Amino acid sequence: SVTVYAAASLTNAINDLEKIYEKQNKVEVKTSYAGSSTLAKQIEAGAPADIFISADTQWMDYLQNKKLVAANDRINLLGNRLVLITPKGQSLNIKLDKATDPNKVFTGKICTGDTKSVPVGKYAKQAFTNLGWWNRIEPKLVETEDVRVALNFVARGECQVGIVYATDAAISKDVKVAGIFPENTHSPIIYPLGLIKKNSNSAKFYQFLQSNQAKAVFKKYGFSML
């Protein structure tokens, strides 16, 4: 068997590839999804993950610095974009530009991941700072421990808007995109793939995630191949 810990934004793609790999190999693939921060900390505490996929470089560096992944056993796999979402039926179009006043466009709460630890929230905080919006945005936040909890809060109408990845908006018929953050507002969204346990089964799955077959699933879900 092989145990894969993956950022919550990767739930649907990795579930699809788990099914494909189990049809092609006599190996069992076990998956665990959560915020990249939670998963890295769990690995640090001894969780038996063979493979880790983070939604930012920071949480893979965190493991590298603890010597839990080698520089040569990680690769940048996927990219994404950062988006604003609204519940379906409460559509908006908001330009993510310093000229926009967040106090006039955001008249309720704003749902995203914890801005200090969950990658989606860290990317969001970079963007708000670059836009000069941080001190007006912070009082509006509801912070969650992964991007999918935030997505669900928006789908259920507990927040007027949310900040999730483009791939999250596309997976949910209950939310719609209200704005795309320009790339120059934040660090590039990069998913490093890391081989944590070096054994025969884990190495095959690590390679499989880079394969032509895996590229097609990731592209289906809206990710970019790096």
Contacting ligand MOO (CB under 6 A), which of 2, 4, 7, 209?
Answer: 7
As a whole number of angstroms, the distance between CA 135 and CA 139 comes to 7
Q: How far is CA 113 from CA 3, 24, 31, 199, 225, in A?
A: 25, 35, 21, 34, 24
Provide the minimum distance between the beta carbon of 112 and ligand MOO in the complex, in angstroms, as a whole number.
9
As a whole number of angstroms, the distance between CA 64 and CA 23 comes to 32
- Closer residue to ligand MOO in complex, CB, 7/137: 7
Window contacting ligand MOO (CB under 6 A); options: 20-28, 116-124, 171-179, 210-218: 116-124
CB 18 within 8 A of CB 223: no
Q: Is 36 annotated as a binding residue?
A: yes
Contacting ligand MOO (CB under 6 A), which of 18, 50, 114, 146?
Answer: 146
As a whole number of angstroms, the distance between CA 150 and CA 168 comes to 10
Window contacting ligand MOO (CB under 6 A); options: 3-11, 65-73, 205-213, 218-226: 3-11
Q: Fill in the per-residue mask, 38 to 57: x = in contact with ligand MOO (CB under 6 A), - = not in contact.
A: -----------------x--
CB 82 within 8 A of CB 123: yes
Q: Fill in the per-residue mask, 155 to 194: x = in contact with ligand MOO (CB under 6 A), - = not in contact.
A: ----------------------------------------
Window contacting ligand MOO (CB under 6 A); options: 6-14, 19-27, 127-135, 217-225: 6-14
Window contacting ligand MOO (CB under 6 A); options: 60-68, 114-122, 197-205, 215-223: 114-122
CB atoms inside a 10 Å sphere around CB 91 = 11
- Closer residue to ligand MOO in complex, CB, 35/102: 35
As a whole number of angstroms, the distance between CA 71 and CA 226 comes to 17
Q: Is 147 annotated as a binding residue?
A: yes
- Closer residue to ligand MOO in complex, CB, 8/169: 8
As a whole number of angstroms, the distance between CA 101 and CA 218 comes to 35
Cβ contacts of 147 within 8 Å, gap of 6 or more: 7, 8, 9, 35, 55, 112, 113, 118, 119, 120, 164, 165, 168
Count residues near ligand MOO (CB under 6 A).
Answer: 12
Q: Is 91 annotated as a binding residue?
A: no
Tell which residue, 71, 64, 83, 66, has the closest CA to residue 182.
83
Q: 203, exposed or middle or buried, with CB in 10 Å at 0-12, 13-18, 19+?
A: middle
Residues annotated within the binding site are 9, 36, 147, 165
Binding site for ligand MOO (CB under 6 A): 7-9, 35-36, 55, 113, 118-120, 146-147
